[PDB]
Structures are given as structure tokens and as C-alpha cells.
Design a protein around this ligand. Sequence first.
Ligand SMILES: [Zn+2]
Ligand SMILES: [Zn+2]
Ligand SMILES: [Zn+2]
Ligand SMILES: [Zn+2]
Ligand SMILES: [Zn+2]
Ligand SMILES: [Zn+2]
Length: 459
Amino acid sequence: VTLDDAQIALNGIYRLASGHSYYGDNYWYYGDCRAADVQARITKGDGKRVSPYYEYNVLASDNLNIVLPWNTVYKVIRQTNNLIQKIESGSIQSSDTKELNRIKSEALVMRGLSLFNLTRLFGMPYTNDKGASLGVPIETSPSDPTHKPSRSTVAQCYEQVVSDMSNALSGLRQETSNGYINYWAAQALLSRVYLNMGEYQKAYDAATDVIKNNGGRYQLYSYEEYPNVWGQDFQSESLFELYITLSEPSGGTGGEGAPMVYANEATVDWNNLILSEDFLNLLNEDPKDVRHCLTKESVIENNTGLPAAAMHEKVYLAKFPGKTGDDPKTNNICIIRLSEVYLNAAEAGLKKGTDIEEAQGYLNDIISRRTTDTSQQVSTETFTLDRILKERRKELVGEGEVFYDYLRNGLAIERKGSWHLETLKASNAQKIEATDLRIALPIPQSEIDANPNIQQNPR
Ligand SMILES: [Zn+2]
Ligand SMILES: [Zn+2]
Ligand SMILES: [Zn+2]
Ligand SMILES: [Zn+2]
Ligand SMILES: [Zn+2]
Ligand SMILES: [Zn+2]
């Protein structure tokens, strides 16, 4: 009915996105445990946390890992469609066009982000085949529940993502907006989207808009600051971050939330994410790297809940310790931050083959703020893709993106570290090519059973 009712609906969409089965957990840690740096601690079998993703053996029947993540993101999409339609139908009793348009624009970005998230889990990487293969169903109007849609292609899905985020931009806030999507967040997310389409110039344009034009609203963390920002709400790099307390969601991000699944607990309980030897070896290539501050040994000495080779290693990631430093369930959920935007620009620049010096500068903006060893900075000769991808692994560990770094670059993922789980042998997941059929998660069996127009991903 009222403008405030519309805002409350939008707040509900953000709350759902922060919840279990969306960014609370599955969409947070998927892009880490599928790569080589963050592994399961222990195998738990089908329907349990982390391991079915990590082992590349998750089934269409998996409620925790397939049914819930699919259905939850579609619920968000449906809510965005209902809200957008309510606004457009003229049946909100408000003359405040600017605010109605802002709410609509934020809903549009959330709709696009949601479709992107589904597409990248359940579809083969766009860059394998210009998105020719199957993506997911596209909904842009309230659900026709008589209607059984079909999966659109990955490219059709990306077109809709790009449209939604782009069409949103002029209605979004220019000012900083803690907890919500503004113009800067949307352009940052577009840089991620375009990069994973191999649309390097468009990625570069979006990322550099944020870098050059944000107006001092956002700042890269200094070396001195870096250890202290983690767990603190809305720090200077954060472009879009969902607000969490123990009151909303009730219980914060809960036991299943990524922060608890990474937790370094006094009694082993919820944890199922630890750093691999691949990651520690990479970070140890530079002993002056400030990011060593985020790797911690088990607080339980002589912990028999770890693989024996990891017992005393610094395999706990401390990025999400909570607002007071000892309750991870209170940690906010940063969706995208400025370091990723600089890295996206660096990668897009190198790949497109122009603006090279500027692009190299953006890589060095990260390197120079993360180490005191000046020789780590790149020249044109040492500005290579591998060097960028190494920096991304160091910078963005735990933030849900590293998997896609391999996929969009056609790179095989190898789990070489000595404490990777033995289940990777039985599941044939020590090496995953970017063309491996198992990269595309199975469509939920609930969909297959219900809708004969929905094809399953091959195996
Ligand atoms: Zn129909
Ligand atoms: Zn099209
Ligand atoms: Zn020890
Ligand atoms: Zn120069
Ligand atoms: Zn600079
Ligand atoms: Zn040096």
C-alpha cells in the first residue's frame, strides 16, 4: 500500500538473501571449496555441509546443497518480481517517484545478481562456449504457476543479468549505503559479471568507473589496517554488505553459516572449512605478506579432528570472527569490496591487451598495500595472468570467487596439498578441468520430477 510497505518488502528481500541457503552459507563458500585453497576438514557424505561440493559428487537429491540453494534464490527472484510489478502497476499509494524508482532499482540489481548466482552454479562457464550450453529458467514477471518453463541458455541468462543491473543504475543511490545496493556496488558487480563473460572492455569500464569516480567514498585497506578490519561492519573497502545481528536473522548466520563453518572452536562442532597446503604454500611465497595475519592454528592443541598432517598448521581462516572478535554468527556478509574491483580491472586490462600500464598499476595498488617487499610489485614484463590470479587467491580467499578465476581462464583446478581429503581419490576430484561436466551442479531432482521441460545437466 505505502512507500514504507514497499521498503519493508525490499528489506525482506535483502534479509532472505542473507539467510541460510543463499549468502549465509552455500553461495558464500561454494566458490572457495570448489577450488584448491579452501577444503573440507572432514567428509560428511550426501546432504551434509561442504564435502559434496568439495568432492564433486553432490547429487540432484541433495536437500542442503542443491534443493535449498535453488529454491531459496528463486524465492528471492519471485519476491523481486512481485515488488517490481507492484511498483510498476501504479498501485502503491505514493507520489515519491524517486524513492519508488530507487526501491525498484535495488530490486532489479538483486534479481540480476540472483539469476547470475544460479547460472554460475547450475550452468557450465560462459567462457567455455559463449554461453551456448543450458543455464537456468528465467523469470522476469510474477510466476505463471500453470507454466512450466524451460532452462534458458547460459548466454540468455547473462543477457538478463546485465540488463537488470544496467537498467537499475540510474535509479540507485550515489551515496554510501550500508546494508543495501548503491550505484558503486552495482557497477562493481557488473565488473564481476562481465569478467566471467570474457567481456573484458565492459568489465574494465565498470571496474574503473568505481575506482576513478567513487568520490573518496571507498578506500583500499592499508597494510597497517588490514589485520583489524575483519569482523568490523562496513569498513572502507565494502561496497555491498548485508547487515547481520543475533536478532536478524534470528541467531545471526547460525551454525550453518560460513563464519561458523570456518570457525576455530574450543570444541570441534560446526567447522568444515580449513585452508589447504596449496594455499599456505602460496602465501608463504612472501613472508612479509600481511595476509599471514588471517591464518591461525587450531585453538585446540593436538587437535585430532584435523587431518594428521594439518594438526599444527595455520589452517583456520580468520576473516569472519564476528563484531566482537569471538562470535562469528554476528559477522556481516560482504558481497563485494574494492580490492576485487581493482583485481577485476587488472585482469580485464591484461586480457584485453590495452590500458596495460593502468591495469598493472591496479594490481600494484593491491600488492603494495599487502607486503613490504617492493620487488613483489610488477613491471610490464612481470605483469602476467598467473601473477594476477595468485594475488586474487591471496586477497579473496574465503570470499566466494576464486573457483570462477580458474573457470573463466580455462584452467584446471588441482588439489595437491598433503592434507586434502582421501575422498578426492575415490571421487576423482584431485584434478578438475574447466570443461568437466561436474562443474555444473545437478538441477534439483524436484524440478526434474515435476517439469519434463527441464533437462538435467549431463554426467
Ligand atoms: Zn506457459
Ligand atoms: Zn537474448
Ligand atoms: Zn600446535
Ligand atoms: Zn608510465
Ligand atoms: Zn595507487
Ligand atoms: Zn624483494
